[PDB]
Design a protein around this ligand. Structure first.
Ligand SMILES: *[C@@H]1O[C@H](CO)[C@@H](O)[C@H](O)[C@H]1NC(C)=O
Length: 32
């Protein structure tokens, strides 16, 4: 980082895309 603004926004946005509340399985069973 260097901006300390676009840093923050970009980091948390990228994190939310990556993790996204861990979409492992979503149908009924919900297997790991
Ligand atoms: C600004 O923010 C982005 C996104 O988080 C980051 O990748 C980058 O290293 C930061 N600094 C610059 C100079 O772009």
């Amino acid at each position: 980082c260097s901006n300390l603004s676009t840093c923050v926004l970009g980091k948390l946005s990228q994190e939310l895309h990556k993790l996204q509340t861990y979409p492992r399985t979503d149908v009924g069973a919900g297997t790991p």
